[PDB]
Amino acid sequence: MQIFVKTLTGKTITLEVEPSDTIENVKAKIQDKEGGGGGGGGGIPPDQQRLIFAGKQLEDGRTLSDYNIQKESTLHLVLRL
């Protein structure tokens, strides 16, 4: 199922995900996809980011299923250093 994720650089990345994917795993895939761009020397480490869905801060260790995140939803990354 696709979701879309706005990165800290303001780029929007599309990603195939499953309900069983942990938020940690989605963050890592998004960062691999955008692949050190926007100054991405070594970018911001994904453990210093959080994924937000529909106004809610998602837990890194929980799964998309836990939040009833549907296909083609847009999520966003924020900085938590």
Curated annotation (Swiss-Prot):
Effect of residue 80 to G: No effect on ADP-ribosylation
Glycyl lysine isopeptide (Lys-Gly) (interchain with G-Cter in ubiquitin) crosslink location in chain: 6, 11, 27, 29, 33, 56, 71
Effect of residue 71 to R: Abolishes HLTF-mediated polyubiquitination of PCNA
PTM-bearing positions, type (Microbial infection) ADP-ribosylthreonine: 74
Compartmental location: Cytoplasm; Nucleus
Site description Essential for function, residues in chain: 76
Site (Interacts with activating enzyme): 62, 80
Domain Ubiquitin-like: 1-81
Modified positions (Phosphoserine) in chain numbering: 73
Posttranslational mods: Phosphorylated at Ser-73 by PINK1 during mitophagy. Phosphorylated ubiquitin specifically binds and activates parkin (PRKN), triggering mitophagy. Phosphorylation does not affect E1-mediated E2 charging of ubiquitin but affects discharging of E2 enzymes to form polyubiquitin chains. It also affects deubiquitination by deubiquitinase enzymes such as USP30.
Function recorded in the entry: Exists either covalently attached to another protein, or free (unanchored). When covalently bound, it is conjugated to target proteins via an isopeptide bond either as a monomer (monoubiquitin), a polymer linked via different Lys residues of the ubiquitin (polyubiquitin chains) or a linear polymer linked via the initiator Met of the ubiquitin (linear polyubiquitin chains).
Name under which the protein is recorded: Ubiquitin
Organism: Homo sapiens (Human)
Gene that encodes the chain: UBA52
